[PDB]
């Protein structure tokens, strides 16, 4: 059981920020890190909980749900990654346990 979730937000008809993902997923556990990126013309993210059960719970409860009315559908699966490596704290990535990270390459 991996504590890391792979997320895809489909029907992105309104922007979804990293902070909004933190808000939604924090209802099921302690979110340690999040990284977002765009690949294959799809908005994706990796999110790490401290507890694998929290990840399981969030997947069961949130998969297929729309973040906002009529858009932004969550497609959630488990990642094989055991943890996440975050280098910066900015609009695309965040390590909630490391407040000293720079916002971009030095």
């Amino acid at each position: 059981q991996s504590p890391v979730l792979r997320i895809i937000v489909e029907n992105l008809f309104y922007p979804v920020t990293l902070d909004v993902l933190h808000q939604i997923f924090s209802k099921f556990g302690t979110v340690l890190k999040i990284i977002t990126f765009t690949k294959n013309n799809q908005f994706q993210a990796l999110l790490q909980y401290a507890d694998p059960v929290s990840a399981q719970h969030a997947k069961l409860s949130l998969d297929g749900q729309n973040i906002y009315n009529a858009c932004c559908t969550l497609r959630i699966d488990f990642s094989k990654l055991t943890s996440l490596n975050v280098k910066y704290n900015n609009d695309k990535s965040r390590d909630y346990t490391r407040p000293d990270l720079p916002s971009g390459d030095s």
């Binding site: 808000q23 949130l62 749900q65 729309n66 973040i67 906002y68 009315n69 009529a70």
Partner: peptide
């Protein structure tokens, strides 16, 4: 209908 309703 959705988790957060209308956008911020």
């Amino acid at each position: 209908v959705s988790l957060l309703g209308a956008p911020p």
